[PDB]
Amino acid sequence: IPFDQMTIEDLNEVFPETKLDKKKYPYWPHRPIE
Amino acid sequence: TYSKPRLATFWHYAKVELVPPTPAEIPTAIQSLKKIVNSAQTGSFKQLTVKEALLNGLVATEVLMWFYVGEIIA
Amino acid sequence: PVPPLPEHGGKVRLGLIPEEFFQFLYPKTGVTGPYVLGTGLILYLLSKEIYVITAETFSAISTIGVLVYIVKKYGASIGAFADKLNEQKIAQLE
Amino acid sequence: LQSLIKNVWIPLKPYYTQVYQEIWVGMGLMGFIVYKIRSADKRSKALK
Amino acid sequence: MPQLDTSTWFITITSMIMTLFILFQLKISNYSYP
Amino acid sequence: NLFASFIAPTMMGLPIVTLIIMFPSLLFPTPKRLINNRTISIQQWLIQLTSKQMMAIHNQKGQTWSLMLMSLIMFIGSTNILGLLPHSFTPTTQLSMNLGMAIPLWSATVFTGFRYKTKTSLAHFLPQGTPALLIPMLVIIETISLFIQPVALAVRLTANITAGHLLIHLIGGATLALLNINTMTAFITFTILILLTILEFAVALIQAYVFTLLVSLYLHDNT
Amino acid sequence: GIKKYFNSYTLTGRMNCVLATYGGIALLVLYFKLR
Amino acid sequence: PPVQVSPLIKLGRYSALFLGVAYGAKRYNYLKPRAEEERRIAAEEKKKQDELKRIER
Amino acid sequence: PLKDRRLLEVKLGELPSWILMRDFTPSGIAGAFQRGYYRYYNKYVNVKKGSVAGLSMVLAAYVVFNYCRSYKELKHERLRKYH
Amino acid sequence: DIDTAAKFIGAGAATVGVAGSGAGIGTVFGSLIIGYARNPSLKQQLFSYAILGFALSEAMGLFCLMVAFLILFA
Amino acid sequence: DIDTAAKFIGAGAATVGVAGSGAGIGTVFGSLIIGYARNPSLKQQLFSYAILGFALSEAMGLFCLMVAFLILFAM
Amino acid sequence: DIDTAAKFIGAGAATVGVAGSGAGIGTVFGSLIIGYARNPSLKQQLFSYAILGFALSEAMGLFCLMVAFLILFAM
Amino acid sequence: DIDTAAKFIGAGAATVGVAGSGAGIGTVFGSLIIGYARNPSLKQQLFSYAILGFALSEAMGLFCLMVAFLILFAM
Amino acid sequence: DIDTAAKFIGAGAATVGVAGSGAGIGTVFGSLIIGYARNPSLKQQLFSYAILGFALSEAMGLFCLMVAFLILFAM
Amino acid sequence: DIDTAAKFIGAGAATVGVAGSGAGIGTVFGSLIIGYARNPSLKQQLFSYAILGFALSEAMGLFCLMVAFLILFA
Amino acid sequence: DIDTAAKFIGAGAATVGVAGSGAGIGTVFGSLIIGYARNPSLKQQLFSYAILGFALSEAMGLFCLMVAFLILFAM
Amino acid sequence: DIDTAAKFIGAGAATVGVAGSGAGIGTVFGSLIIGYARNPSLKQQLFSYAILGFALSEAMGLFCLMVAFLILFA
| Chain F residues with CB-CB distance to G25 below 8 A | 140
Angstroms from K68 CA to nearest CA on chain L: 15
Reduced to 3 states, what is the DSSP secondary structure of residue I11?
A: strand
What's the CA gap between E27 and F43, in Å, rounded?
Answer: 12
Residues recorded for chain Q: 74
The whole domain housing B61 covers 45-74
Where do the domains of chain P lie, and which CATH numbers do they carry? 2-73 (1.20.20.10)
Touch test L–F: 3 Cβ pairs or more under 8 Å:
yes
Q: Do F66 and A7 touch (CB under 8 A)?
A: no
Closest Cβ–Cβ partner in C56, C78, C90 for F87: C56
Amino acid at position B60, single letter = A
What's the CA gap between F99 and F200, in Å, rounded?
Answer: 22
What's the CA gap between I41 and I22, in Å, rounded?
Answer: 24
Region of A30 on the Ramachandran plot (φ > 0 left; ψ -120 to 50 alpha; else beta): left
Same domain, C44 and C79: no
Closest Cβ–Cβ partner in M3, M17, M22 for K5: M3
Q: Which residues, 6+ apart, have CB-to-CB distance to J56 below 8 Å?
A: F145, L25, L29, L54, L58
Q: Do E33 and A30 touch (CB under 8 A)?
A: yes
Contact (Cβ atoms closer than 8 angstroms) between residue P12 and residue N10: yes
Amino acid at position M42, single letter = L
Q: Do D8 and E9 touch (CB under 8 A)?
A: no
In SS3 terms, chain F reads as CCHHHHCCCCCCCCCCCCCCCCHHHHCCCCCCCCCCCHHHHHHHHHHHHHHHHHCCCCCCHHHHHHHHHHHHHHHHHHHHHHCCCCCCCCHHHCHHHHHHHHHHHHHHHHHHHHHCCHHHHHHHCCCCCCCCCCHHHHCCHHHHHHHHHHHHHHHHHHHHHHHHHHHHHHHHHHHHHHHHHCCHHHHHHHHHHHHHHHHHHHHHHHHHHHHHHHHHHHHHHHC
**Angle at CA of residue K37, ends K36 and K38, nearest 5°:** 90
| Chain J residues with CB-CB distance to F152 below 8 A | 55, 58-59, 62
Chain D CB within 8 Å of residue A26 CB: yes
What are the respective helix, strand and coil percentages of chain B, to the nearest 5? 80, 0, 20
Closest Cβ–Cβ partner in K52, K55, K66 for F162: K66
Closest Cβ–Cβ partner in I7, I10, I13 for B46: I13
Reduced to 3 states, what is the DSSP secondary structure of residue G21?
A: helix
Residue C17: beta bridge partners? Answer: C13
In SS3 terms, chain L reads as CHHHHHHHHHHHHHCCCCHHHHHHHHHHHHHHHHHHHHCCCCHHHHHHHHHHHHHHHHHHHHHHHHHHHHHHCCC
Which 4-63 residues of chain C touch chain I by CB within 8 A?
5-10, 12, 15-16, 18, 48-49, 51-54, 60
If you ran DSSP here, which 8-state letter would residue P74 be given? I
| Chain M residues with CB-CB distance to K6 below 8 A | 6
> What's the Cα-to-Cα distance from P31 to each of F106, J54, P38, P50, rounded to whole Å?
41, 25, 11, 8
Nearest residue on chain L to F141, alpha-carbon basis: L55
Q: Do F31 and E25 touch (CB under 8 A)?
A: no
**Angle at CA of residue B47, ends B41 and B53, nearest 5°:** 90
* Structure determination technique employed: cryo-EM
Q: Where is Q24: in which H helix or E strand?
A: helix Q19-38
What's the CA gap between I30 and H17, in Å, rounded?
Answer: 47
User: Could you check whether the bond before residue B20 is cis, i.e. omega within 30 degrees of 0?
Assistant: no
| Chain J residues with CB-CB distance to F146 below 8 A | none
What's the CA gap between Q35 and K10, in Å, rounded?
Answer: 45
Contact (Cβ atoms closer than 8 angstroms) between residue H42 and residue I81: no
| Chain F residues with CB-CB distance to D27 below 8 A | 104
Alpha helical stretches, state H, chain P: 2-15, 19-38, 43-69
| Chain P residues with CB-CB distance to Q22 below 8 A | 17, 19-24, 57, 60-61
Please, which contacts does Q4-8 make with residues 24 or more away whose CB atoms are closer than 8 Å? Q4/P3, Q4/P6, Q5/O5, Q5/P2, Q5/P3, Q5/P5, Q5/P6, Q6/O4, Q6/O5, Q6/O6, Q6/O7, Q6/O8, Q6/O9, Q6/P6, Q7/O8, Q7/Q71, Q7/Q72, Q7/Q74, Q8/P3, Q8/P6, Q8/P7, Q8/P9, Q8/P10, Q8/P71
Chain O / chain Q CB contacts < 8 angstroms: 144
| Chain M residues with CB-CB distance to O24 below 8 A | 22-27, 29
Nearest residue on chain J to L72, alpha-carbon basis: J71
> What's the Cα-to-Cα distance from Q18 to each of I77, P16, P21, rounded to whole Å?
50, 10, 10
Touch test O–N: 3 Cβ pairs or more under 8 Å:
no
Same domain, C62 and C88: yes
| Chain B residues with CB-CB distance to I11 below 8 A | 46-50
| Chain F residues with CB-CB distance to J48 below 8 A | 57, 217
Angstroms from M28 CA to nearest CA on chain K: 4
What's the CA gap between N37 and I67, in Å, rounded?
Answer: 61
| Chain G residues with CB-CB distance to F129 below 8 A | 8-9
What's the resolution in A? 3.9
Reduced to 3 states, what is the DSSP secondary structure of residue M64?
A: helix
Nearest residue on chain F to L48, alpha-carbon basis: F130
Contact (Cβ atoms closer than 8 angstroms) between residue N22 and residue P25: no
Provide the Cα torsion J23, J26, J31, J37; round to 10°: -160
Residues recorded for chain E: 34
| Chain M residues with CB-CB distance to O8 below 8 A | none
Q: Do H27 and B59 touch (CB under 8 A)?
A: no
Interface of A with C (CB under 8 A): 3-7, 10-11, 18
Angstroms from D15 CA to nearest CA on chain A: 8
Q: Do N56 and P25 touch (CB under 8 A)?
A: yes
Number of domains in chain D: 1
**Angle at CA of residue F208, ends F202 and F214, nearest 5°:** 125
Residue B26 belongs to some domain of the structure:
no
Nearest residue on chain C to A10, alpha-carbon basis: C1
Nearest residue on chain E to D27, alpha-carbon basis: E17
What's the CA gap between I50 and F125, in Å, rounded?
Answer: 55
| Chain F residues with CB-CB distance to J56 below 8 A | 145
CA dihedral for P39, P42, P43, P47, sign (positive or negative): negative
Q: Do M24 and K25 touch (CB under 8 A)?
A: yes
Residue Q60: beta bridge partners? Answer: none
DSSP string, E1-34: -GGG-GGGHHHHHHHHHHIIIIIHHHHGGG----
The whole domain housing D48 covers 22-48
Angstroms from P64 CA to nearest CA on chain Q: 7
What's the CA gap between O38 and O26, in Å, rounded?
Answer: 19
Q: Which residues, 6+ apart, have CB-to-CB distance to O12 below 8 Å?
A: O68, Q9, Q10, Q11, Q12, Q13, Q14, Q67, Q68, Q71
Residue D27 belongs to some domain of the structure:
yes
Looking at chain Q, which subunits does it touch, using at least 3 CB pairs closer than 8 Å as the criterion? O, P
CB neighbours of residue B52 within 10 Å = 13
What are the respective helix, strand and coil percentages of chain H, to the nearest 5? 85, 0, 15
Domain limits of chain A?
Answer: 1-34
Closest Cβ–Cβ partner in Q5, Q15, Q29 for P6: Q5
Chain J / chain K CB contacts < 8 angstroms: 153
Reduced to 3 states, what is the DSSP secondary structure of residue N1?
A: coil
Phi, psi of F172 (to 5 degrees): -60, -40
Q: Do B55 and C28 touch (CB under 8 A)?
A: yes
If you ran DSSP here, which 8-state letter would residue D9 be given? S
Q: Where is C13: in which H helix or E strand?
A: strand C12-13
